[PDB]
PDB file of C-alpha atoms (C1' of nucleotides) in Angstrom:
ATOM      1  CA  UNK A 390      -0.070  -0.075  -0.017  1.00 25.04           C
ATOM      2  CA  UNK A 391       2.702   2.544   1.041  1.00 25.17           C
ATOM      3  CA  UNK A 392       4.816   3.989  -1.729  1.00 23.73           C
ATOM      4  CA  UNK A 393       8.495   5.152  -1.364  1.00 27.36           C
ATOM      5  CA  UNK A 394       8.941   8.597  -2.376  1.00 25.53           C
ATOM      6  CA  UNK A 395      12.248   7.977  -4.212  1.00 27.22           C
ATOM      7  CA  UNK A 396      14.136   4.675  -5.000  1.00 27.33           C
ATOM      8  CA  UNK A 397      17.860   3.486  -4.497  1.00 23.76           C
ATOM      9  CA  UNK A 398      18.242  -0.084  -5.847  1.00 28.31           C
ATOM     10  CA  UNK A 399      21.562   0.205  -7.623  1.00 29.57           C
ATOM     11  CA  UNK A 400      23.081   0.664  -4.067  1.00 29.20           C
ATOM     12  CA  UNK A 401      26.165  -1.392  -3.251  1.00 28.90           C
ATOM     13  CA  UNK A 402      25.850  -1.554   0.643  1.00 30.49           C
ATOM     14  CA  UNK A 403      29.321  -2.774   2.089  1.00 28.95           C
ATOM     15  CA  UNK A 404      29.306  -5.284   4.759  1.00 26.78           C
ATOM     16  CA  UNK A 405      31.337  -3.487   7.191  1.00 27.19           C
ATOM     17  CA  UNK A 406      30.748  -3.132  10.828  1.00 23.47           C
ATOM     18  CA  UNK A 407      29.842  -0.265  13.120  1.00 25.00           C
ATOM     19  CA  UNK A 408      31.134  -1.927  16.527  1.00 23.18           C
ATOM     20  CA  UNK A 409      34.599  -0.826  17.286  1.00 22.87           C
ATOM     21  CA  UNK A 410      37.096  -3.059  18.967  1.00 22.24           C
ATOM     22  CA  UNK A 411      36.473  -1.037  22.163  1.00 20.45           C
ATOM     23  CA  UNK A 412      33.482  -3.202  22.913  1.00 20.94           C
ATOM     24  CA  UNK A 413      34.535  -6.784  22.278  1.00 24.60           C
ATOM     25  CA  UNK A 414      36.600  -7.090  25.464  1.00 25.34           C
ATOM     26  CA  UNK A 415      34.914  -4.852  27.891  1.00 24.32           C
ATOM     27  CA  UNK A 416      37.629  -4.157  30.244  1.00 24.58           C
ATOM     28  CA  UNK A 417      41.485  -3.436  30.444  1.00 26.05           C
ATOM     29  CA  UNK A 418      42.052  -6.724  31.835  1.00 24.41           C
ATOM     30  CA  UNK A 419      39.933  -8.230  29.391  1.00 24.83           C
ATOM     31  CA  UNK A 420      42.124  -8.012  26.234  1.00 22.98           C
ATOM     32  CA  UNK A 421      44.350 -10.296  24.563  1.00 24.27           C
ATOM     33  CA  UNK A 422      47.630  -9.719  22.677  1.00 24.53           C
TER      34      UNK A 422
ATOM     35  C1'  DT B   1    -105.435 161.453  90.563  1.00 21.14           C
ATOM     36  C1'  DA B   2    -103.389 157.187  89.019  1.00 22.31           C
ATOM     37  C1'  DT B   3    -102.712 152.849  85.940  1.00 23.95           C
ATOM     38  C1'  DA B   4    -102.638 150.370  81.570  1.00 23.79           C
ATOM     39  C1'  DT B   5    -101.977 150.497  76.300  1.00 24.32           C
ATOM     40  C1'  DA B   6    -100.097 152.351  71.915  1.00 24.07           C
ATOM     41  C1'  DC B   7     -97.111 154.928  69.102  1.00 22.88           C
ATOM     42  C1'  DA B   8     -93.061 157.038  67.926  1.00 23.57           C
ATOM     43  C1'  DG B   9     -88.130 158.093  69.065  1.00 24.34           C
ATOM     44  C1'  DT B  10     -83.329 155.979  69.515  1.00 27.13           C
ATOM     45  C1'  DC B  11     -79.428 152.878  69.943  1.00 26.92           C
ATOM     46  C1'  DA B  12     -77.152 149.222  67.465  1.00 28.20           C
ATOM     47  C1'  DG B  13     -76.970 146.015  64.287  1.00 27.52           C
ATOM     48  C1'  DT B  14     -77.377 145.097  59.623  1.00 27.37           C
ATOM     49  C1'  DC B  15     -76.739 146.459  55.184  1.00 27.95           C
ATOM     50  C1'  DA B  16     -74.332 149.143  51.182  1.00 29.36           C
ATOM     51  C1'  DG B  17     -70.766 151.937  48.978  1.00 26.51           C
ATOM     52  C1'  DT B  18     -65.540 153.473  49.313  1.00 26.95           C
ATOM     53  C1'  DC B  19     -60.814 152.435  48.199  1.00 25.83           C
ATOM     54  C1'  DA B  20     -55.834 150.020  48.359  1.00 25.29           C
ATOM     55  C1'  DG B  21     -53.243 145.660  48.113  1.00 22.35           C
ATOM     56  C1'  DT B  22     -52.510 141.113  45.495  1.00 20.86           C
ATOM     57  C1'  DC B  23     -52.011 137.205  42.233  1.00 20.11           C
ATOM     58  C1'  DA B  24     -53.213 134.615  37.997  1.00 21.32           C
ATOM     59  C1'  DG B  25     -52.737 134.614  33.471  1.00 18.97           C
ATOM     60  C1'  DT B  26     -49.793 136.449  29.659  1.00 20.88           C
ATOM     61  C1'  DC B  27     -46.807 139.388  26.465  1.00 22.68           C
ATOM     62  C1'  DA B  28     -42.155 139.044  25.476  1.00 24.88           C
ATOM     63  C1'  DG B  29     -37.349 140.271  25.173  1.00 24.44           C
ATOM     64  C1'  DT B  30     -32.822 137.627  25.292  1.00 25.46           C
ATOM     65  C1'  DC B  31     -29.834 134.289  26.020  1.00 24.96           C
ATOM     66  C1'  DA B  32     -28.271 130.119  25.199  1.00 25.50           C
ATOM     67  C1'  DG B  33     -28.381 126.099  22.994  1.00 25.92           C
ATOM     68  C1'  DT B  34     -28.543 123.665  18.839  1.00 23.48           C
ATOM     69  C1'  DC B  35     -28.623 122.903  13.413  1.00 24.17           C
ATOM     70  C1'  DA B  36     -26.640 124.036   7.702  1.00 23.41           C
ATOM     71  C1'  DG B  37     -22.495 124.894   3.262  1.00 21.40           C
ATOM     72  C1'  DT B  38     -17.399 126.313   2.116  1.00 21.54           C
ATOM     73  C1'  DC B  39     -13.370 125.265   2.071  1.00 20.29           C
ATOM     74  C1'  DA B  40      -8.879 123.052   3.348  1.00 19.31           C
ATOM     75  C1'  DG B  41      -6.981 119.863   5.240  1.00 15.69           C
ATOM     76  C1'  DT B  42      -7.055 114.419   5.431  1.00 17.29           C
ATOM     77  C1'  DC B  43      -6.420 110.338   3.524  1.00 16.31           C
ATOM     78  C1'  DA B  44      -6.669 105.988   0.954  1.00 16.86           C
ATOM     79  C1'  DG B  45      -7.063 104.136  -4.022  1.00 15.76           C
ATOM     80  C1'  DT B  46      -4.273 103.138  -8.461  1.00 16.86           C
ATOM     81  C1'  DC B  47      -1.225 103.186 -11.926  1.00 18.95           C
ATOM     82  C1'  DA B  48       4.142 101.630 -13.284  1.00 19.64           C
ATOM     83  C1'  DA B  49       9.372 100.190 -12.924  1.00 16.71           C
ATOM     84  C1'  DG B  50      12.643  97.642 -11.455  1.00 14.82           C
ATOM     85  C1'  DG B  51      14.948  94.714  -7.869  1.00 14.21           C
ATOM     86  C1'  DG B  52      16.336  90.327  -7.429  1.00 11.96           C
ATOM     87  C1'  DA B  53      16.188  85.643  -5.898  1.00 12.35           C
ATOM     88  C1'  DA B  54      14.063  81.593  -7.881  1.00 11.96           C
ATOM     89  C1'  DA B  55      14.420  78.690 -11.742  1.00 14.21           C
ATOM     90  C1'  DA B  56      16.545  76.831 -15.724  1.00 10.26           C
ATOM     91  C1'  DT B  57      21.227  75.457 -18.197  1.00 12.50           C
ATOM     92  C1'  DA B  58      25.594  73.193 -18.584  1.00 11.61           C
ATOM     93  C1'  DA B  59      29.593  70.546 -17.406  1.00 11.55           C
ATOM     94  C1'  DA B  60      33.051  67.569 -14.996  1.00  9.73           C
ATOM     95  C1'  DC B  61      32.829  64.394 -11.577  1.00  8.53           C
ATOM     96  C1'  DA B  62      31.274  60.628  -7.894  1.00 12.05           C
ATOM     97  C1'  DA B  63      28.234  57.230  -5.365  1.00 11.62           C
ATOM     98  C1'  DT B  64      24.487  54.090  -5.344  1.00  9.91           C
ATOM     99  C1'  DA B  65      21.126  50.994  -7.138  1.00  3.72           C
ATOM    100  C1'  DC B  66      19.664  46.467  -9.854  1.00  2.00           C
ATOM    101  C1'  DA B  67      19.986  41.596 -11.859  1.00  3.00           C
ATOM    102  C1'  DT B  68      22.185  37.724 -11.650  1.00  5.49           C
ATOM    103  C1'  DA B  69      26.154  33.860 -11.182  1.00  2.00           C
ATOM    104  C1'  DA B  70      28.102  31.097  -7.811  1.00  2.00           C
ATOM    105  C1'  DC B  71      27.522  28.723  -3.555  1.00  4.53           C
ATOM    106  C1'  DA B  72      26.514  27.682   1.624  1.00  2.00           C
ATOM    107  C1'  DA B  73      23.375  25.562   4.750  1.00  2.00           C
ATOM    108  C1'  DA B  74      19.522  23.461   6.849  1.00  2.00           C
ATOM    109  C1'  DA B  75      15.140  20.829   6.167  1.00  2.00           C
ATOM    110  C1'  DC B  76      13.061  16.421   4.540  1.00  2.00           C
ATOM    111  C1'  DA B  77      13.821  11.581   2.886  1.00  2.00           C
ATOM    112  C1'  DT B  78      15.180   6.565   1.740  1.00  2.00           C
ATOM    113  C1'  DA B  79      17.939   1.988   2.019  1.00  2.00           C
ATOM    114  C1'  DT B  80      20.133  -1.666   4.007  1.00  2.00           C
ATOM    115  C1'  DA B  81      23.427  -3.973   6.758  1.00  2.00           C
ATOM    116  C1'  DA B  82      24.344  -4.069  11.413  1.00  2.00           C
ATOM    117  C1'  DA B  83      23.591  -3.826  17.016  1.00  2.00           C
ATOM    118  C1'  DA B  84      20.744  -4.736  20.163  1.00  2.00           C
ATOM    119  C1'  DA B  85      16.978  -6.111  21.817  1.00  2.00           C
ATOM    120  C1'  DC B  86      13.310  -9.025  21.566  1.00  2.00           C
ATOM    121  C1'  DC B  87      10.192 -12.890  20.946  1.00  2.00           C
ATOM    122  C1'  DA B  88       9.737 -17.951  21.718  1.00  2.00           C
TER     123       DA B  88
END
DNA sequence: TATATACAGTCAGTCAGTCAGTCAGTCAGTCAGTCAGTCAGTCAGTCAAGGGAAAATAAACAATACATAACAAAACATATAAAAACCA
């Protein structure tokens, strides 16, 4: 029923992440080398 | 001889004339107060130049307005993979 007011389909979205490394150890002691 | 009645005389009051003051009603000067033309002096209406600042002109020179080209910035909008919830 809805209509998008303007289309982007030839987009090529890149599979790249927004979570930095700062948020996959969660502590100073929690980090490997 | 004396007393009572009437008539005529006599004073006084009343009646009429004499003359010397007096005031109302006019006559009228005169004196003063108020109305007519000349002129001479007053006074504003009117017919003309001309003074002079505004208006117009001109020329060299300066400042502002207008239309637009280029762009900056903020609101409105979508898409999809990715986090993080979030169902189950």
